[PDB]
Design an enzyme around this catalytic site. Structure first.
Site, PDB file in Angstrom:
ATOM      1  N   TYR A 185     -14.536   1.030  -2.509  1.00  0.00           N
ATOM      2  CA  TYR A 185     -13.195   0.412  -2.298  1.00  0.00           C
ATOM      3  C   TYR A 185     -12.786  -0.557  -3.356  1.00  0.00           C
ATOM      4  O   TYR A 185     -13.464  -1.517  -3.802  1.00  0.00           O
ATOM      5  CB  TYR A 185     -13.231   0.016  -0.825  1.00  0.00           C
ATOM      6  CG  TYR A 185     -11.835  -0.293  -0.336  1.00  0.00           C
ATOM      7  CD1 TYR A 185     -10.885   0.709  -0.110  1.00  0.00           C
ATOM      8  CD2 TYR A 185     -11.485  -1.626  -0.078  1.00  0.00           C
ATOM      9  CE1 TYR A 185      -9.592   0.366   0.295  1.00  0.00           C
ATOM     10  CE2 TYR A 185     -10.204  -1.947   0.357  1.00  0.00           C
ATOM     11  CZ  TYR A 185      -9.247  -0.950   0.549  1.00  0.00           C
ATOM     12  OH  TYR A 185      -8.007  -1.347   0.993  1.00  0.00           O
ATOM     13  N   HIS A 186     -11.551  -0.369  -3.846  1.00  0.00           N
ATOM     14  CA  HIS A 186     -10.957  -1.210  -4.901  1.00  0.00           C
ATOM     15  C   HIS A 186     -11.356  -0.996  -6.336  1.00  0.00           C
ATOM     16  O   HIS A 186     -11.086  -1.858  -7.243  1.00  0.00           O
ATOM     17  CB  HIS A 186     -11.094  -2.752  -4.677  1.00  0.00           C
ATOM     18  CG  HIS A 186     -10.198  -3.153  -3.545  1.00  0.00           C
ATOM     19  ND1 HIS A 186     -10.380  -4.324  -2.837  1.00  0.00           N
ATOM     20  CD2 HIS A 186      -9.087  -2.592  -3.035  1.00  0.00           C
ATOM     21  CE1 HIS A 186      -9.435  -4.438  -1.941  1.00  0.00           C
ATOM     22  NE2 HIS A 186      -8.634  -3.422  -1.994  1.00  0.00           N
TER      23      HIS A 186
ATOM     24  N   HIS B 276      -6.160   1.391  -5.565  1.00  0.00           N
ATOM     25  CA  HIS B 276      -6.349   1.971  -4.233  1.00  0.00           C
ATOM     26  C   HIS B 276      -6.387   3.484  -4.184  1.00  0.00           C
ATOM     27  O   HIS B 276      -5.942   4.084  -3.207  1.00  0.00           O
ATOM     28  CB  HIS B 276      -5.173   1.400  -3.323  1.00  0.00           C
ATOM     29  CG  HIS B 276      -5.402  -0.048  -2.971  1.00  0.00           C
ATOM     30  ND1 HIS B 276      -5.188  -1.128  -3.786  1.00  0.00           N
ATOM     31  CD2 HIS B 276      -5.906  -0.591  -1.811  1.00  0.00           C
ATOM     32  CE1 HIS B 276      -5.563  -2.267  -3.214  1.00  0.00           C
ATOM     33  NE2 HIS B 276      -5.969  -1.936  -2.003  1.00  0.00           N
TER      34      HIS B 276
ATOM     35  N   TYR C  93       0.799  -1.253   0.000  1.00  0.00           N
ATOM     36  CA  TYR C  93       0.000   0.000   0.000  1.00  0.00           C
ATOM     37  C   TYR C  93       0.824   1.293   0.000  1.00  0.00           C
ATOM     38  O   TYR C  93       0.307   2.376   0.332  1.00  0.00           O
ATOM     39  CB  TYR C  93      -0.990   0.017   1.162  1.00  0.00           C
ATOM     40  CG  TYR C  93      -2.263  -0.806   1.045  1.00  0.00           C
ATOM     41  CD1 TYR C  93      -2.310  -1.957   0.281  1.00  0.00           C
ATOM     42  CD2 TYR C  93      -3.411  -0.468   1.798  1.00  0.00           C
ATOM     43  CE1 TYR C  93      -3.397  -2.778   0.177  1.00  0.00           C
ATOM     44  CE2 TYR C  93      -4.555  -1.247   1.652  1.00  0.00           C
ATOM     45  CZ  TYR C  93      -4.546  -2.380   0.848  1.00  0.00           C
ATOM     46  OH  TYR C  93      -5.661  -3.153   0.675  1.00  0.00           O
TER      47      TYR C  93
END
Ligand SMILES: [Cu+2]
Ligand code: NA
Length: 639
Positions: free
Chosen positions: A495-496, A581, A272
């Protein structure tokens, strides 16, 4: 799992038509409501007709259709599982037109879905272009058609979404293949999950806008599960993927050879972290406490040439940490990094504190102050987006995101940051009145014209849950300092999810989920067509064409001459992007100053500073007076 966006339509009244059906495997078996019966095309004794096989439905009446479900055969036989497919809608049963969805479904027996924008149709056709194992047959156990509660036609002048691209995987990471123009997507060790991975394998998929073919492939060669990584297009045009499920690895994707190659191990295990190409073609990385340990992960730099990772211990992560409630695990992730002048890297957030990262020596960091304005200091914006819409004037637009990675409300903050010389405190101001919609986990791309397209996200960040979705995208027009809503979409992208600019000027938006069992997986993407491609009459405008390029590989400071088929008002260079992300450190736009040579011949120079015109591949677009852009031309920029 997955889910449809609408409600299932009653099958009382339907009339189904099939190309072939074996007695026992009748057309209607797919619409009886029993998971044990299934339609099957001719086999054995009736012979073996190859795909395409077609399943047509007559609803009798006109419905607000928005989706389909295809549950394959559940008897443990794989024969007839649909790979490549197409979905068409007709009001008359004769004029189908263009597919509302197309793509490939994964080779498994889970219910496959086609989610698409709402369109009133009485007839529905599903074409099986391919069986998933390369067989001649098609088999369907149950088939359903979904409906929207209401129908509201897109408003003119606000873009259009559609078609839907069906994918074998949840595209949680993507990249454009520069030399081929294909969209490259990856998930993790599985098509729909990352949890408890053994590492070393990555499932990848590609979509070719020219041929419309969707294909997949397992990458094991770099012995890396590429989920949750750093992504950078380096100085040589290679995509550098670092860490993630295999926290110390480096995999390189070479677009040319279309191959994956093993790179050197990073010095520090990370997940990340954001990575940024530098003015010299090198890749810088910092943070990433999601994987390989939770501790202070300082800077490191990769040299494509020597193929080594070198630690930069004084390039300290500490000044850039957010104040996340989960502490370090989240505080050093997804830094908003931009390669700038003289081997420098600017860090624009998400922390309130912005910093200057130097790559000389054992590195350094210098404060750039705080993201703030007349309305006060900007709070931490974890998962906010940062877009360099004018690298020439060093303009970066920042928006949305939240103080904490999750369980935090998103904001509408928006800022314009102007960069000068490395080591200086850039100027930051509020952008217009902020976004129209508070969002987190949204994505964005800078369009040919310098405007930024903003789409997706939710108002309160709760990964894997499709709650408080924003379906209404926004475009920021720098020249006007105004934000504008666009036609809304129907698929939640939280998200994603991902966004990338396609070489034809259209936006590829897809993904969200990657939670195995959850029903919030989205195995697809939609295409958004900006109003710049439509003429006054809702029809597609005619595009200027680039009839010639003096060359396609240029040094910074170098010059390019082109001829067009029509007179062009403006030109821009857009570096090829990479996304995952909410992070895209590859895109940036350079506005071009054109020299008219008369006779629809123009020349321009590529900026001389390699910190502005970061080396790698770029798309060249030309706009007429009407504002309609050409399909990009690919230019390789070398320092
Ligand atoms: Cu994630
Ligand atoms: Na059935």
């Amino acid at each position: 799992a997955s889910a449809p966006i609408g409600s299932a339509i009653s099958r009382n009244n339907w009339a189904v038509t099939c190309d072939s059906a074996q007695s026992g495997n009748e057309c209607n078996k797919a619409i009886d409501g029993n998971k044990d019966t299934f339609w099957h095309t001719f086999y054995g004794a009736n012979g073996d007709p190859k795909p395409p096989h077609t399943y047509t439905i007559d609803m009798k009446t006109t419905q607000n259709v928005n989706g389909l479900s295809m549950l394959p055969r559940q008897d443990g036989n794989q024969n007839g599982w649909i790979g490549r497919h197409e979905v068409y809608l007709s009001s008359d049963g004769t004029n189908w037109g263009s597919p509302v969805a197309s793509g490939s479904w994964f080779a498994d027996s889970t219910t496959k879905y086609s989610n698409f924008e709402t369109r009133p149709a009485r007839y529905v056709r599903l074409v099986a272009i391919t069986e998933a194992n390369g067989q001649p047959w098609t088999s369907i156990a149950e088939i359903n058609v979904f409906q929207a509660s209401s129908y509201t036609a897109p408003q003119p002048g606000l873009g259009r979404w559609g078609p839907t691209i069906d994918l074998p995987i949840v595209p949680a990471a993507a990249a454009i293949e520069p030399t081929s123009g294909r969209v490259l997507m990856w998930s993790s060790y599985r098509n729909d999950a990352f949890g408890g991975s053994p590492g070393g394998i990555t499932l990848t998929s590609s979509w070719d806008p020219s041929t419309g073919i969707v294909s997949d492939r397992t990458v094991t060669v770099t012995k890396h599960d590429m989920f949750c990584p750093g992504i950078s297009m380096d100085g040589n045009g290679q995509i550098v993927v670092t860490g993630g499920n295999d926290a110390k690895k480096t995999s390189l994707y070479d677009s040319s050879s279309d191959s994956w190659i093993p790179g050197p191990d990073m010095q520090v295990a990370r997940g990340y972290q954001s990575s940024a190409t530098m003015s010299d073609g090198r890749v810088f990385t910092i943070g990433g406490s999601h994987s390989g340990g939770v501790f202070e992960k300082n800077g490191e730099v990769y040299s494509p040439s020597s193929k080594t990772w070198t630690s930069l211990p004084n390039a300290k992560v500490n000044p850039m940490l957010t104040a996340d409630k989960q502490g370090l695990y989240r505080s050093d992730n997804h830094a908003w990094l931009f390669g700038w002048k003289k081997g420098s890297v600017f860090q624009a957030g998400p922390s309130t504190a912005m910093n200057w990262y130097y790559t000389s020596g054992s590195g350094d960091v210098k404060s750039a102050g705080k993201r703030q304005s007349n309305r006060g200091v900007a709070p931490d914006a974890m998962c906010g987006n940062a877009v360099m819409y004018d690298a020439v004037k060093g303009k970066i637009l920042t928006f949305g995101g939240s103080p904490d990675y999750q369980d935090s409300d998103a904001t509408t903050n928006a800022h314009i940051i102007t960069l000068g010389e490395p080591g200086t405190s850039p100027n930051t101001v509020f952008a217009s009145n902020g976004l129209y919609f508070a969002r987190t986990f949204h994505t964005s791309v800078v369009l040919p014209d310098g405007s930024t397209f903003i789409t997706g996200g939710q108002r309160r960040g709760i990964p894997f849950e499709d709650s408080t979705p924003v379906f209404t995208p926004e475009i920021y027009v720098p020249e006007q300092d105004t934000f504008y809503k666009q036609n809304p979409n129907s698929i939640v992208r939280v998200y994603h999810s991902i966004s990338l600019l396609l070489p034809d000027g259209r936006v590829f938006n897809g993904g969200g989920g990657l939670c195995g069992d959850c029903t919030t997986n989205h195995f697809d993407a939609q295409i958004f067509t900006p109003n710049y491609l439509y003429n006054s009459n809702g029809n597609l405008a005619t595009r200027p064409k680039i009839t010639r390029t003096s060359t396609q590989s240029v040094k910074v400071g170098g010059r390019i001459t082109i001829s067009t088929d029509s007179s062009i008002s403006k030109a821009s260079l857009i570096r090829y992007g990479t996304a995952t992300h909410t992070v895209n450190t590859d895109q940036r736009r350079i506005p071009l100053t054109l020299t008219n040579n008369g006779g629809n011949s123009y020349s321009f120079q590529v900026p001389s500073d390699s910190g502005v015109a970061l080396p790698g591949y770029w798309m060249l677009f030309v706009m007429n007076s009407a504002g309609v852009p050409s399909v990009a031309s690919t230019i390789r920029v070398t320092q």
